């Protein structure tokens, strides 16, 4: 077995240890978006109508 | 071991940033082919459509899925969803803009709406929006 | 080590497979959003005129009665019809009166686009407003007409009735 | 062809639309006629009534 | 300016007062008119009816 | 602030973020719909403007 901590070099858990931290997964997953936004809008208006009809 | 554990978190975070954006553009154009589950991304789409409908004040009278468009792409089967909600013009523009600001793949396209009251005695607009997500083949 | 290193070569294989397809997507799409403007175009606004001033390729019918105007139109989407409807007014309409002009629209006897709902007589309560000169009763209807293989409109056909001011 | 339902007078409310010029009332009927050993149609016979625009 | 609510005949009960000479019936309406790309008002259009004193 | 002003909040409706309303910020508008007295709506407004 391994004891309270193990023996002393530490033993061996730099390799168990290191190629753990962690599982990894790595869970290459669950990201989030800013999305993006569109822009508005082209006029100046023109008259024919509606000046005469009001 | 300990450096590899750094690589795992780095690349998992890069995966999350993918999903976050590669999905979103799977709505814009659409995106890759797929790894896709999207089996774990359709019922959440229906649920979030219901939520944005509720917070916009609309009565969701009917949500109807579609058939996948077997000839709608070589790298993707498009599933369309036809949504049917009723309320005010401000509230349906709201519902639409919220679905168009979502983090998921609901590309709304052909829209319609009309006055649902026969006699026309109170203001009310039944609205039917078509919005689709693109699963893989 | 050799387990999780393999895990990571796979996860980064994903992240790259990922990152290269995204740049083709942004681009293909930007093309697609230029093209949707290229199908709204031949129907919408800038595209036949002759100075880009409105109304342009535009809105359809206009008919007045010196108290209200019952118009008939077409817009780009849920947006420019929203810009147009905002520029006027928004109202809770209630007791509508039915008149012989409605049936003349059902009869086709007064020439119009019977995509349209009818009517032009009611009592209005303001919800929102922007033009102090215009009391729009409501966006009476709106239907996005797609077209066919012979050609597009793709735009949103609509109908509005509005009593002005004065 | 009295495969057909009848009628041509009613009051219509829009559900969906594509032709701004056409108000179809409904696909009044549709029946897939198979045929016999003397010959086929196999197609779907149908009936529609539609008030145009103008 | 048929931005305005109508009317000018009613029966009034005082809530608050400042001019002993003026009985305002109510701020009959008020709508902030924004304008367009051709120009602003941005102000709040309104309508009031008031019976004076004397 | 609507309740302590005595107003009935008939509808609160969020908006869409204004993707073209700024380079450094997405503006989310909220349209509020409350009913009551003129004094109470001026009150509601001034309280939201002192928040």
Coordinates of C-alpha atoms in Angstrom, one line a residue:
Chain A
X1 CA 0.0 0.0 0.0
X2 CA 0.9 3.7 0.3
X3 CA 1.1 5.0 3.9
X4 CA -0.1 8.5 5.5
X5 CA 2.0 10.2 3.2
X6 CA 4.0 7.5 1.4
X7 CA 7.8 6.8 2.1
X8 CA 10.1 9.9 1.3
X9 CA 11.4 10.6 -2.4
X10 CA 8.2 11.2 -2.3
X11 CA 8.1 8.1 -3.5
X12 CA 7.1 8.0 -7.2
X13 CA 4.0 10.4 -7.1
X14 CA 5.7 13.0 -9.2
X15 CA 4.8 10.5 -12.1
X16 CA 1.4 9.4 -10.7
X17 CA 1.1 12.8 -9.2
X18 CA 1.9 14.7 -12.3
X19 CA 0.2 12.8 -15.1
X20 CA -2.7 13.0 -12.9
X21 CA -3.6 16.5 -11.8
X22 CA -6.2 15.4 -12.8
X23 CA -8.1 12.9 -14.7
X24 CA -7.8 15.9 -16.9
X25 CA -10.8 14.9 -18.9
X26 CA -9.8 17.4 -20.3
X27 CA -13.5 18.3 -20.8
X28 CA -13.0 20.2 -24.0
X29 CA -16.6 21.5 -23.7
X30 CA -18.9 23.9 -22.3
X31 CA -18.1 27.4 -23.5
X32 CA -20.2 30.6 -23.6
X33 CA -20.9 33.2 -26.3
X34 CA -20.9 37.1 -26.4
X35 CA -22.8 36.4 -29.5
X36 CA -22.4 39.5 -31.9
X37 CA -24.9 42.3 -32.8
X38 CA -26.0 43.9 -36.1
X39 CA -26.3 47.7 -36.9
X40 CA -29.2 50.1 -37.8
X41 CA -30.5 51.8 -40.2
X42 CA -30.4 53.9 -43.5
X43 CA -32.6 56.9 -44.0
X44 CA -33.4 60.3 -44.4
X45 CA -37.1 60.2 -45.7
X46 CA -38.4 61.9 -48.8
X47 CA -41.7 63.8 -49.5
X48 CA -44.2 63.8 -52.3
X49 CA -46.9 62.7 -50.3
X50 CA -47.3 63.0 -47.3
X51 CA -47.2 66.9 -47.3
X52 CA -50.2 67.5 -49.6
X53 CA -52.4 64.6 -48.1
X54 CA -52.1 66.1 -44.5
Chain B
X1 CA 2.3 14.2 -14.9
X2 CA 1.9 17.7 -13.5
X3 CA 2.6 19.5 -16.8
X4 CA 0.2 17.2 -18.6
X5 CA -2.4 18.1 -16.0
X6 CA -1.9 21.7 -17.1
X7 CA -2.4 20.8 -20.8
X8 CA -5.7 19.0 -19.9
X9 CA -7.3 22.1 -18.3
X10 CA -6.0 24.4 -21.1
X11 CA -7.5 22.3 -23.9
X12 CA -10.7 21.6 -22.0
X13 CA -11.1 25.4 -21.7
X14 CA -10.4 25.7 -25.4
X15 CA -13.1 23.1 -26.0
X16 CA -15.6 25.1 -24.0
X17 CA -14.7 28.2 -26.0
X18 CA -15.4 26.2 -29.1
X19 CA -18.8 25.0 -28.1
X20 CA -19.6 28.5 -27.1
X21 CA -18.8 29.9 -30.5
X22 CA -18.7 27.1 -33.1
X23 CA -22.2 26.2 -32.1
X24 CA -23.4 29.9 -32.4
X25 CA -22.1 30.0 -35.9
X26 CA -23.8 26.6 -36.6
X27 CA -26.7 29.0 -36.3
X28 CA -25.2 31.9 -38.4
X29 CA -24.2 30.0 -41.5
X30 CA -24.0 26.7 -39.9
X31 CA -20.6 25.2 -39.1
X32 CA -18.5 22.1 -39.4
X33 CA -19.9 18.8 -40.1
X34 CA -20.1 17.7 -36.5
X35 CA -18.9 15.8 -33.5
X36 CA -22.4 16.7 -32.4
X37 CA -24.4 15.1 -29.7
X38 CA -27.1 17.8 -30.3
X39 CA -29.2 15.0 -28.9
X40 CA -28.3 17.0 -25.7
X41 CA -29.1 20.3 -27.4
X42 CA -32.6 20.1 -28.9
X43 CA -34.8 19.7 -25.8
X44 CA -32.8 22.5 -24.2
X45 CA -33.6 24.6 -27.3
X46 CA -37.4 23.9 -26.9
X47 CA -37.1 24.6 -23.2
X48 CA -35.3 28.0 -23.7
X49 CA -37.8 28.9 -26.4
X50 CA -40.5 28.3 -23.9
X51 CA -38.6 30.5 -21.3
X52 CA -38.0 33.4 -23.6
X53 CA -41.6 33.1 -24.6
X54 CA -42.8 33.3 -21.0
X55 CA -40.6 36.2 -20.0
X56 CA -41.8 38.1 -23.1
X57 CA -45.4 37.6 -21.8
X58 CA -46.5 35.5 -24.8
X59 CA -48.9 32.5 -24.7
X60 CA -47.1 29.6 -26.4
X61 CA -50.1 28.1 -28.2
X62 CA -48.1 25.5 -30.1
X63 CA -44.5 24.4 -30.7
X64 CA -44.1 21.9 -33.5
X65 CA -40.8 20.2 -34.5
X66 CA -40.1 19.4 -38.2
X67 CA -38.5 16.8 -40.3
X68 CA -34.8 16.8 -40.8
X69 CA -34.0 18.1 -44.3
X70 CA -32.2 15.1 -45.8
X71 CA -31.5 17.1 -48.9
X72 CA -30.8 20.3 -47.1
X73 CA -27.1 19.8 -46.9
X74 CA -24.3 17.2 -47.3
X75 CA -22.7 17.9 -43.9
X76 CA -25.9 18.5 -41.9
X77 CA -29.5 17.6 -41.5
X78 CA -31.5 20.7 -40.7
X79 CA -34.4 20.2 -38.2
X80 CA -36.9 23.1 -38.4
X81 CA -39.1 24.1 -35.5
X82 CA -42.3 26.0 -36.1
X83 CA -43.3 28.1 -33.0
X84 CA -46.8 29.6 -32.5
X85 CA -47.1 32.3 -29.8
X86 CA -49.7 35.0 -29.3
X87 CA -49.5 38.5 -27.7
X88 CA -48.6 42.1 -28.5
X89 CA -46.5 43.4 -31.4
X90 CA -43.9 44.6 -28.9
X91 CA -43.8 41.3 -27.2
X92 CA -43.4 39.2 -30.4
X93 CA -40.6 41.5 -31.7
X94 CA -39.2 40.9 -28.2
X95 CA -39.6 37.1 -28.4
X96 CA -37.9 37.1 -31.9
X97 CA -35.0 39.3 -30.9
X98 CA -34.4 37.2 -27.8
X99 CA -34.3 34.0 -29.8
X100 CA -31.9 35.8 -32.2
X101 CA -29.7 36.7 -29.2
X102 CA -29.6 33.1 -27.9
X103 CA -26.5 31.0 -27.4
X104 CA -28.0 28.2 -29.4
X105 CA -28.7 27.3 -33.0
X106 CA -32.1 28.7 -33.6
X107 CA -31.9 30.6 -36.9
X108 CA -35.2 32.3 -37.3
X109 CA -36.3 32.9 -40.9
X110 CA -39.8 33.1 -42.4
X111 CA -42.0 35.0 -39.9
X112 CA -45.8 35.7 -39.9
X113 CA -48.5 37.1 -37.6
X114 CA -52.1 38.3 -37.8
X115 CA -55.0 39.5 -35.6
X116 CA -56.4 36.4 -33.9
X117 CA -59.8 38.0 -33.0
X118 CA -62.6 37.4 -35.5
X119 CA -64.8 40.4 -34.6
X120 CA -61.7 42.4 -33.7
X121 CA -62.9 43.6 -30.3
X122 CA -59.5 43.6 -28.5
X123 CA -55.9 43.8 -29.7
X124 CA -54.2 40.4 -30.0
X125 CA -51.6 39.0 -32.5
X126 CA -51.2 35.3 -33.2
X127 CA -47.6 34.9 -34.4
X128 CA -46.0 31.9 -36.2
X129 CA -42.2 32.0 -36.5
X130 CA -40.1 29.4 -38.3
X131 CA -36.7 28.7 -36.7
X132 CA -34.3 25.8 -37.4
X133 CA -31.2 24.1 -36.0
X134 CA -28.7 22.1 -38.0
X135 CA -27.9 18.6 -36.6
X136 CA -25.4 16.5 -38.6
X137 CA -26.2 13.9 -41.3
Chain C
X1 CA 1.3 10.0 -17.7
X2 CA 0.9 8.1 -20.9
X3 CA -2.9 7.9 -20.3
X4 CA -3.7 11.6 -19.8
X5 CA -1.1 12.7 -22.4
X6 CA -3.1 10.7 -24.9
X7 CA -6.3 12.3 -23.5
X8 CA -4.7 15.7 -24.3
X9 CA -3.5 14.9 -27.8
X10 CA -7.1 13.9 -28.5
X11 CA -8.7 17.0 -26.9
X12 CA -6.3 19.3 -28.7
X13 CA -6.9 17.3 -31.9
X14 CA -10.5 18.4 -31.4
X15 CA -9.6 22.0 -30.5
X16 CA -7.7 22.3 -33.8
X17 CA -10.2 20.4 -36.0
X18 CA -12.5 23.0 -34.4
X19 CA -10.5 26.2 -34.9
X20 CA -9.9 25.7 -38.6
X21 CA -13.5 25.1 -39.5
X22 CA -14.7 28.2 -37.6
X23 CA -12.8 30.6 -39.9
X24 CA -14.4 29.0 -43.0
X25 CA -17.8 29.3 -41.3
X26 CA -17.6 33.1 -40.4
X27 CA -16.6 33.6 -44.0
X28 CA -19.2 31.4 -45.7
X29 CA -21.8 33.0 -43.5
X30 CA -20.7 36.6 -44.2
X31 CA -21.3 35.6 -47.9
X32 CA -24.7 34.2 -46.9
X33 CA -25.7 37.5 -45.2
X34 CA -24.5 39.5 -48.2
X35 CA -26.7 37.2 -50.3
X36 CA -29.8 37.5 -48.2
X37 CA -29.4 41.2 -48.8
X38 CA -29.0 40.2 -52.5
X39 CA -32.5 38.6 -52.4
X40 CA -34.1 41.3 -50.3
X41 CA -32.4 43.8 -52.7
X42 CA -34.4 43.1 -55.9
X43 CA -37.5 43.6 -53.7
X44 CA -36.6 46.0 -50.9
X45 CA -35.4 49.6 -51.1
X46 CA -32.1 50.7 -52.6
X47 CA -32.2 48.5 -55.6
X48 CA -34.3 50.0 -58.4
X49 CA -33.8 53.7 -57.8
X50 CA -32.3 56.3 -58.8
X51 CA -31.2 57.9 -55.6
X52 CA -31.6 55.8 -52.4
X53 CA -34.5 57.9 -51.1
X54 CA -37.9 56.4 -49.9
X55 CA -40.3 55.0 -50.7
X56 CA -38.2 52.8 -52.8
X57 CA -39.0 49.3 -54.4
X58 CA -41.0 49.5 -51.2
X59 CA -44.5 49.6 -50.0
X60 CA -47.6 48.9 -52.1
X61 CA -50.9 50.8 -51.9
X62 CA -52.1 54.0 -50.4
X63 CA -55.8 55.0 -49.9
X64 CA -57.1 57.9 -47.7
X65 CA -60.4 59.4 -46.6
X66 CA -59.3 62.8 -45.1
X67 CA -59.5 61.3 -41.6
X68 CA -57.5 58.1 -41.9
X69 CA -55.2 56.4 -44.4
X70 CA -55.4 52.6 -44.9
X71 CA -52.1 51.7 -46.4
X72 CA -50.7 48.4 -47.9
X73 CA -47.0 47.7 -47.9
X74 CA -43.9 45.5 -47.7
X75 CA -40.8 45.7 -45.6
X76 CA -37.4 43.9 -45.3
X77 CA -38.1 41.9 -42.2
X78 CA -39.2 42.0 -38.5
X79 CA -36.9 45.0 -38.3
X80 CA -37.7 47.7 -40.9
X81 CA -41.4 47.0 -40.4
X82 CA -40.6 47.5 -36.7
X83 CA -38.7 50.7 -37.4
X84 CA -41.6 51.9 -39.5
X85 CA -44.2 50.9 -37.0
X86 CA -42.2 52.5 -34.2
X87 CA -41.9 55.7 -36.1
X88 CA -45.7 56.0 -36.0
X89 CA -47.7 54.7 -33.0
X90 CA -49.0 51.7 -31.1
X91 CA -52.5 51.3 -29.8
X92 CA -54.9 49.0 -28.0
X93 CA -57.9 49.0 -30.3
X94 CA -61.3 47.9 -29.1
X95 CA -64.9 48.2 -30.4
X96 CA -64.6 47.8 -34.2
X97 CA -67.4 48.8 -36.5
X98 CA -68.1 46.7 -39.6
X99 CA -68.8 48.7 -42.8
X100 CA -69.7 48.0 -46.4
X101 CA -66.1 48.8 -47.5
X102 CA -64.8 45.7 -45.7
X103 CA -67.1 43.5 -47.7
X104 CA -66.1 45.3 -50.9
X105 CA -62.6 44.2 -50.0
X106 CA -64.0 40.6 -49.5
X107 CA -65.9 41.1 -52.8
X108 CA -62.7 42.2 -54.5
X109 CA -64.9 45.0 -55.7
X110 CA -62.5 47.7 -54.5
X111 CA -59.1 47.0 -56.0
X112 CA -56.5 46.0 -53.4
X113 CA -53.7 42.9 -52.2
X114 CA -56.1 40.6 -50.3
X115 CA -53.1 39.3 -48.4
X116 CA -54.5 42.1 -46.3
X117 CA -56.9 42.1 -43.3
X118 CA -59.7 44.5 -43.8
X119 CA -61.4 47.3 -41.8
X120 CA -60.8 51.0 -41.1
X121 CA -63.2 52.0 -38.3
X122 CA -62.6 51.5 -34.6
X123 CA -61.8 53.2 -31.3
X124 CA -58.1 53.5 -30.3
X125 CA -56.2 53.7 -27.0
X126 CA -52.5 54.6 -27.0
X127 CA -49.8 52.1 -26.0
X128 CA -46.7 53.6 -27.4
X129 CA -46.1 56.6 -29.6
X130 CA -43.3 58.4 -31.5
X131 CA -44.9 60.7 -34.1
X132 CA -47.1 63.2 -32.2
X133 CA -48.9 63.6 -35.6
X134 CA -49.8 60.0 -36.2
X135 CA -52.2 57.6 -34.5
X136 CA -51.6 54.2 -36.0
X137 CA -54.3 51.8 -35.0
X138 CA -52.1 48.6 -35.4
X139 CA -50.0 46.6 -37.8
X140 CA -53.1 45.1 -39.1
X141 CA -51.2 42.2 -40.7
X142 CA -47.8 40.9 -41.8
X143 CA -46.8 37.8 -43.7
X144 CA -43.3 37.0 -45.1
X145 CA -43.9 36.1 -48.7
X146 CA -41.1 33.9 -49.9
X147 CA -41.7 33.4 -53.6
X148 CA -40.8 30.5 -55.9
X149 CA -38.3 29.2 -58.4
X150 CA -39.4 31.9 -60.8
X151 CA -38.3 34.6 -58.4
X152 CA -38.1 36.1 -55.0
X153 CA -39.6 38.7 -52.8
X154 CA -38.8 37.1 -49.4
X155 CA -39.8 40.3 -47.8
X156 CA -42.6 40.8 -45.2
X157 CA -45.8 42.0 -46.8
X158 CA -47.9 44.0 -44.3
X159 CA -50.9 46.3 -43.8
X160 CA -51.4 49.3 -41.5
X161 CA -54.2 51.8 -41.0
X162 CA -53.4 55.2 -39.4
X163 CA -55.4 58.4 -38.6
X164 CA -53.0 61.3 -38.9
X165 CA -53.4 64.6 -37.0
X166 CA -55.1 67.9 -37.8
Chain D
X1 CA -65.1 14.6 -59.8
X2 CA -67.3 13.9 -56.7
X3 CA -64.3 12.5 -55.0
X4 CA -64.4 16.1 -53.9
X5 CA -65.8 17.8 -50.9
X6 CA -68.2 20.7 -51.9
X7 CA -68.6 24.3 -50.9
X8 CA -67.1 27.7 -51.9
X9 CA -68.4 30.3 -49.3
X10 CA -67.0 30.9 -45.9
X11 CA -64.9 33.3 -43.7
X12 CA -61.1 32.8 -43.5
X13 CA -58.4 33.6 -41.0
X14 CA -54.7 33.3 -42.0
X15 CA -52.5 30.6 -40.5
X16 CA -49.6 30.6 -42.9
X17 CA -49.0 32.3 -46.2
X18 CA -46.5 32.4 -49.1
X19 CA -48.3 34.0 -52.1
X20 CA -49.3 37.6 -51.1
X21 CA -51.7 37.3 -53.9
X22 CA -53.5 34.1 -52.9
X23 CA -55.8 33.4 -50.0
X24 CA -56.3 29.6 -50.1
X25 CA -59.2 28.6 -47.8
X26 CA -57.9 25.0 -47.2
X27 CA -56.9 21.8 -48.9
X28 CA -60.6 20.8 -49.0
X29 CA -59.8 17.1 -49.5
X30 CA -57.2 14.6 -50.6
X31 CA -57.4 10.9 -51.2
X32 CA -54.6 8.7 -52.7
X33 CA -56.3 6.8 -55.5
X34 CA -54.4 3.5 -56.1
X35 CA -56.1 2.1 -59.2
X36 CA -56.5 -1.6 -60.2
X37 CA -55.0 -4.4 -62.3
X38 CA -56.2 -2.5 -65.4
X39 CA -54.0 0.5 -64.6
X40 CA -52.5 3.0 -62.1
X41 CA -52.8 6.5 -60.9
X42 CA -51.5 5.9 -57.4
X43 CA -51.4 9.7 -57.0
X44 CA -53.2 11.8 -54.4
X45 CA -56.4 13.3 -55.8
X46 CA -57.2 16.5 -54.1
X47 CA -59.5 19.6 -54.0
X48 CA -58.7 23.2 -53.0
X49 CA -60.7 26.5 -53.1
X50 CA -58.8 29.8 -53.2
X51 CA -59.8 33.5 -53.5
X52 CA -57.0 35.3 -55.3
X53 CA -56.2 39.1 -54.9
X54 CA -57.3 42.2 -56.7
Chain E
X1 CA -52.7 67.5 -32.6
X2 CA -54.6 64.2 -32.3
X3 CA -51.7 62.9 -30.3
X4 CA -54.2 64.2 -27.7
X5 CA -56.9 62.6 -25.7
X6 CA -60.2 64.3 -26.1
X7 CA -62.9 65.6 -23.8
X8 CA -63.6 68.8 -21.7
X9 CA -66.6 68.0 -19.5
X10 CA -66.5 66.2 -16.2
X11 CA -66.8 66.6 -12.4
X12 CA -63.6 67.2 -10.4
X13 CA -62.3 66.4 -6.8
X14 CA -59.1 68.0 -5.6
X15 CA -56.1 65.9 -4.8
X16 CA -53.3 68.5 -4.7
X17 CA -53.3 72.2 -5.5
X18 CA -50.9 75.1 -5.9
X19 CA -52.7 77.9 -7.9
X20 CA -55.8 79.0 -5.9
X21 CA -57.0 80.3 -9.2
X22 CA -56.7 77.1 -11.3
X23 CA -58.6 73.8 -11.2
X24 CA -56.7 71.5 -13.5
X25 CA -58.7 68.4 -14.3
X26 CA -55.7 66.2 -15.1
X27 CA -52.7 65.8 -17.3
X28 CA -54.9 64.3 -20.0
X29 CA -52.0 62.7 -21.8
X30 CA -48.3 62.8 -22.4
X31 CA -46.1 61.0 -24.9
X32 CA -42.3 61.6 -25.4
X33 CA -42.0 62.1 -29.2
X34 CA -38.5 61.1 -30.3
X35 CA -38.3 62.1 -33.9
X36 CA -36.3 60.6 -36.7
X37 CA -33.0 61.0 -38.7
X38 CA -34.5 64.1 -40.3
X39 CA -34.7 65.8 -36.9
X40 CA -35.5 65.8 -33.2
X41 CA -38.1 66.9 -30.8
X42 CA -37.3 64.3 -28.1
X43 CA -39.6 66.3 -25.8
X44 CA -42.7 65.1 -24.0
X45 CA -45.9 66.1 -25.9
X46 CA -48.8 66.5 -23.6
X47 CA -52.4 67.7 -23.1
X48 CA -54.2 69.3 -20.1
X49 CA -57.6 70.8 -19.5
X50 CA -58.2 73.3 -16.8
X51 CA -61.1 75.5 -15.5
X52 CA -59.6 78.7 -14.1
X53 CA -61.3 80.8 -11.4
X54 CA -63.8 83.7 -11.4
Chain F
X1 CA -39.8 50.8 -5.9
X2 CA -43.0 50.2 -7.9
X3 CA -44.7 48.6 -4.9
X4 CA -43.7 51.3 -2.4
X5 CA -44.9 54.0 -4.9
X6 CA -48.3 52.3 -4.9
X7 CA -48.2 51.3 -8.6
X8 CA -49.6 48.1 -10.1
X9 CA -46.8 46.7 -12.2
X10 CA -48.9 45.4 -15.2
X11 CA -45.9 44.3 -17.2
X12 CA -42.1 44.3 -17.2
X13 CA -40.5 43.2 -20.5
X14 CA -36.8 42.9 -21.0
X15 CA -35.3 43.8 -24.4
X16 CA -32.6 42.6 -26.8
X17 CA -29.0 43.6 -26.3
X18 CA -28.1 46.3 -28.8
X19 CA -25.3 44.6 -30.7
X20 CA -24.7 47.8 -32.6
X21 CA -25.3 50.1 -29.7
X22 CA -21.6 50.3 -28.7
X23 CA -18.2 48.8 -29.2
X24 CA -17.5 48.3 -25.5
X25 CA -21.0 47.4 -24.3
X26 CA -24.2 45.7 -25.2
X27 CA -27.1 47.7 -24.0
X28 CA -30.1 45.7 -22.7
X29 CA -33.3 47.8 -22.5
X30 CA -36.1 47.1 -20.2
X31 CA -39.6 48.4 -20.9
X32 CA -41.7 48.8 -17.7
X33 CA -45.5 49.2 -17.6
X34 CA -47.0 50.4 -14.3
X35 CA -50.4 52.1 -13.6
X36 CA -51.5 54.6 -11.0
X37 CA -51.6 58.3 -10.2
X38 CA -49.5 61.0 -11.8
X39 CA -47.8 61.7 -8.4
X40 CA -47.0 58.0 -8.0
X41 CA -45.5 57.6 -11.5
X42 CA -43.4 60.7 -11.1
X43 CA -42.4 59.1 -7.8
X44 CA -41.6 55.7 -9.4
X45 CA -39.5 57.5 -12.1
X46 CA -37.5 59.6 -9.6
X47 CA -36.8 56.6 -7.4
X48 CA -35.5 54.6 -10.4
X49 CA -33.4 57.7 -11.2
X50 CA -32.0 57.7 -7.7
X51 CA -31.1 54.0 -7.6

